């Protein structure tokens, strides 16, 4: 899928497509956007952990577990909601509201 929802977490491998963009929670715990295979952006958390997870969480933070420990986060928590993380068709990854604002962006947006 493209978009993750709150609530909900991609597991270990799992990942966000769109064409040949690629935004995936690694074995090595890193988090990163390839553009055709090749890394554009990442947390830089490998080596961290391993078995990591990637979850959308109600409060709209973002946060790469492995098993019950935190190993990084987007830092937006804020009030429960309904977000959802996409990659978008611009390469950019957004988490949005139910409203069309972000709250965050890795700002790989291409074209604009």
């Given amino acids: 899928?493209?978009?993750?929802?709150?609530?909900?977490?991609?597991d270990t491998?799992?990942?966000?497509?769109?064409?040949?963009?690629?935004f995936i929670i690694q074995n090595d715990c890193n988090?990163?956007?390839y553009d055709n295979n090749r890394a554009v952006w990442a947390s830089?958390?490998?080596?961290?952990a391993s078995g990591c997870v990637l979850k959308m969480q109600n409060d709209g933070n973002l946060v790469i577990y492995s098993?019950?420990?935190?190993?990084?986060a987007s830092n937006t928590n804020r009030q429960n909601g309904n977000y959802y993380l996409i990659?978008?068709?611009?390469?950019?990854?957004?988490i949005y509201d139910n409203s069309n604002n972000a709250i965050w962006a890795t700002h790989t947006?291409?074209?604009n």
């Fill in 109 to 111: 947006n291409v074209g």
């Fill in 31 to 33: 988090l990163v956007l």
């Fill in 13 to 22: 491998g799992g990942s966000l497509a769109e064409g040949g963009y690629l």
């Fill in 87 to 94: 990659l978008q068709r611009d390469r950019n990854v957004v």
């Fill in 1 to 10: 899928s493209d978009r993750l929802n709150s609530g909900h977490q991609l």
């Fill in 44 to 48: 830089g958390t490998n080596g961290k």
């Fill in 67 to 72: 098993g019950s420990r935190a190993i990084w």
